[PDB]
């Protein structure tokens, strides 16, 4: 879960979210399409770092 690539998914919305980046070892922003994708997908950076 904490090692999935940031996936925007098939939907075409633009929603600011966070994922854990294993290379940088910290959470980073990405744009999520609003559906599908994977669980490496958080609303806030703090919550991301909380889980990952």
């Amino acid at each position: 879960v904490c090692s999935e690539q940031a996936e925007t998914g098939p939907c075409r919305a633009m929603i600011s979210r966070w994922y854990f980046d294993v290379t940088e070892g910290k959470c980073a922003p990405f744009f999520y399409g609003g559906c599908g994708g994977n669980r490496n997908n958080f609303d806030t950076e703090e919550y991301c770092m909380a889980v990952c």
Partner: protein, 224 residues
Amino acid sequence: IVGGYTCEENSLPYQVSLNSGSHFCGGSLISEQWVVSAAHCYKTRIQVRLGEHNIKVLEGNEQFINAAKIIRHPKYNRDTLDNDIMLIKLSSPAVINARVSTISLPTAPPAAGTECLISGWGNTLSFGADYPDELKCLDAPVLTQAECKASYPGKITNSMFCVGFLEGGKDSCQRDAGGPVVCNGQLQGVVSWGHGCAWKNRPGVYTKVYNYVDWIKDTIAANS
């Protein structure tokens, strides 16, 4: 919009943008009090922006109105994206004028080969991110059902149809969702989903507005 061009300044008076902290989806003004968008663009709180061309630059024509009712289609499926359509009721009526106006609901289904106009402030790159400040347009044909099912085996529902180019290069993209597909003066489509943007053999998939015309009418009457 990938592979499109900049819309003429006052040309799409029915194009809207959905806004929370920022622009995240499009929509279409269909009456002075109601907007059509996608169910997956649903948020609990939405400000609607009308009369926009450059979302970063106050030009003088804009109306900012908060949603007072946001209504996903009752049968919207979050896993299959079936019935991906949504109504927003504006909290005050929009003022109808040269720069803010209604697009007609369809009186018939879309026919393959018809050239349509797709618009939005969506990403302009198939790889990478380049979000525009100015409204983009794309002229694109409705594809046959066979074409649509062949590109997305086991994924095309009765509420979905495809517009675009099998050869790729031109498509709607992220931040375009909920925006209009307009054919011969009628709103035929709502930007929904796709595999990538403008990828070879992965045309954009859109909600078939014509299938919700009765639902739209009844919902508007139920909430007046």
